[PDB]
């Protein structure tokens, strides 16, 4: 699809069998989602945003559907103001920015 | 252009007569620039993201050149870790996400 930016670019995602809303975020290196349970082991990561740094849980090789497109990759879990789909998974679904 | 997202979508901007590098951020409602002086009146604002909130100065009707495209709108100025072009100006240069 072609998504204009007059509103937040919110899409439905599916992760763990659960549907959630997430923001397509070209300004995010990584994908970050609100607290939820994911399978497997996790590793620590610190990420930065506009207000400073937070600790998150890094889960690798997680199956996630984004706007009906399948991705398998790293998902960070932690106290984020919004579920965000970052460039690691935007590249998997072939997204580009155009103007 | 068409910008792929293998790397951060960084562009050159001109604001207040200054050249800066900035990130095209579809996950940002607002445009936020590192500390600088801008003309006219401003008002205080709090903006949030990962890590919490920062206090910024809100200037309205500011013109910015983004990768050669002029746009006008509100620019926020404050202690942001990165210069960010948000949706309020991305819309004006006709930026879309496509996949
Ligand atoms: C080479 C990598 C080294 C570092 C490596 N990476 C990072 O930490 C990278 C740089 N961080 C980022 O890319 C993070 C996203 C998290 C992540 O990807 O991990 N990006 C971001 O946080 C970018 C801006 C940014 C970019 C780079 C540096 C700093 C800031 N903004 C995304 C963020 C989304 C929002 C839902 C929380 N938007 C914002 O922060 C904007 N905020 C807004 O638009 C708000 N009004 C809306 C949400 C807030 N909620 C609320 N008020 N209830 C703001 C810029 C005007 C790491 N630490 O592992
Ligand atoms: Cl990944
Ligand atoms: Cl505006
Ligand atoms: Cl349009
Ligand atoms: Na003004």
Could you tell me which residues are beta bridge partners of residue A93?
A: none
> Is B50 in CB contact (< 8 Å) with chain A?
yes
The answer to whether the CB of A99 falls within 8 A of the CB of B8 is: no
Most distant CA atoms of chain B, gap in Å? 40
Q: How many CB atoms lie within 10 A of CB A28?
A: 28
**Which one, of B41, B42, B32, lies nearest residue B64 by Cα?**
B32
Residue ranges of E strands in A1-99: 2-3, 10-15, 18-24, 32-33, 43-49, 52-66, 69-77, 84-85, 96-98
d(CA A53, CA A93): 28
d(CA B66, CA B85): 9
CB–CB of B5 and A29 under 8 A? no
Q: How far apart are the two ends of chain B, measured CA to CA in Å?
A: 15
Q: What is the DSSP letter of B92?
A: G
Could you tell me which residues are beta bridge partners of residue B38?
A: none
Cα dihedral B75, B78, B83, B84, rounded to 10, equals -50
**Domain containing B3 — which CATH number?**
2.40.70.10
Q: How many CB atoms lie within 10 A of CB B58?
A: 17
Which candidate in A51, A56, A66 is best for mutational testing of the B interface (most B CBs within 10 A)?
A51
Q: How many domains does chain B have?
A: 1
Q: Which domain holds residue B19?
A: 1-99
* HSE value, Cβ hemisphere, 13 Å, CA-based, for A68: 2
């Amino acid at each position: 699809p072609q998504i204009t930016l007059w509103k937040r670019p919110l899409v439905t995602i599916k992760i763990g069998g659960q549907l959630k809303e997430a923001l397509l975020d070209t300004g995010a290196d990584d994908t970050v989602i609100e607290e939820m349970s994911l399978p497997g082991r996790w590793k620590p990561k610190m990420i930065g945003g506009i207000g400073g740094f937070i600790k998150v849980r890094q889960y690798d090789q997680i199956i996630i559907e984004i706007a009906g497109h399948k991705a398998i990759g790293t998902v960070l879990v932690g106290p984020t103001p919004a579920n965000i789909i970052g460039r690691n998974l935007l590249t998997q679904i072939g997204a580009t920015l155009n103007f």
